[PDB]
């Protein structure tokens with residue numbers, strides 16, 4: 001077994017390879033999109049993870065697409081996250097913040113000024129997002145058609161990622177994960193399906209990857225490359241965003257570019273909850289010979305599959321989502337081959353402590 005051995009992840013050393021995937025839970029305070037002490041308890045319970053990766057967190061108010069998702073742009077958000085990371089560190093854990101801009105997976109009612117959300121192009125996502133009703137309960141609502149960003153608005157988006165990384169470092173996070181997956185803003189630019197621009201930010205793969213690489217460079221300069229990870233979902237379809245007709249070649253272009261920056265890790269979300277074709281081992285080997293940081297795999301993994309791929313020299317760590325929702329001591333359970341707590345999906349999104357902090361350890 002290698003799952004219970006240490007791994008150097010940029011500037012941090014994880015004691016095991018069992019990571020907590022980023023999981024949106026929609027329990028923040030409104031107004032202000034403020035993290036809470038309840039969220040702090042939830043993360044502290046999971047501090048034995050080799051690395052915790054937080055729920056997706058807004059870089060700015062414009063970044064918001066889901067009612068109840070936290071931000072990392074305001075003074076009050078910084079102060080609340082500082083308490084949360086201090087609690088994880090008091091339990092000897094490590095925590096990364098996942099930073100996003102939702103782009104077109106959003107609704108005008110939760111944008112600044114009630115305006116349409118932004119994207120690469122003025123194309124509706126044709127999906128839903130999560131709002132709150134008048135009683136504070138999570139509800140699903142069709143996405144609003146976005147406005148295409150003007151060329152002169154792109155530097156501001158880059159700066160918003162940079163600023164959020166400055167804030168994250170101050171807030172005590174160990175690493176930052178850029179959310180470049182699942183059809184959110186960075187992925188909206190990467191994918192030809194969602195990006196019909198004819199300027200330097202659309203068309204060729206070089207142009208489609210331009211924004212995400214500008215963001216990577218800005219955040220490495222703000223902090224250090226060994227503090228930066230990135231999550232991609234570059235093979236298959238996620239939230240109606242496919243990866244275009246040359247997905248493998250385009251993914252390998254992006255990964256070779258990322259490798260040049262010496263970033264801490266590449267986190268691959270391999271399939272959504274409905275599943276799909278597995279990554280081929282040939283593709284995994286092409287990724288591995290191009291990237292020389294840590295590779296994290298995710299998407300309906302088992303411990304056995306993680307061991308197999310770590311033993312083949314193809315990935316370094318696994319991130320578990322739903323098993324981490326339900327098992328605060330997932331590491332110990334996998335080590336001991338114990339049963340896993342029964343999951344309660346009704347309480348994944350929204351609500352309070354029930355189905356959040358009430359799953360027991362062994």
Ligand SMILES: Cc1cc2nc3c(=O)[nH]c(=O)nc-3n(C[C@H](O)[C@H](O)[C@H](O)COP(=O)(O)O)c2cc1C
Pocket residue numbers: 021022023024025054055056098179181182231269272273298299300301319320321322323348349
């Ligand atoms: C309730 C829920 C919320 C999620 N929120 C995020 C998120 O904030 N960021 C992200 O990149 N992926 C998110 N995901 C995907 C998970 O990180 C993970 O990749 C996925 O759950 C598949 O892995 P699993 O079979 O281990 O659960 C979410 C998944 C679920 C079920």
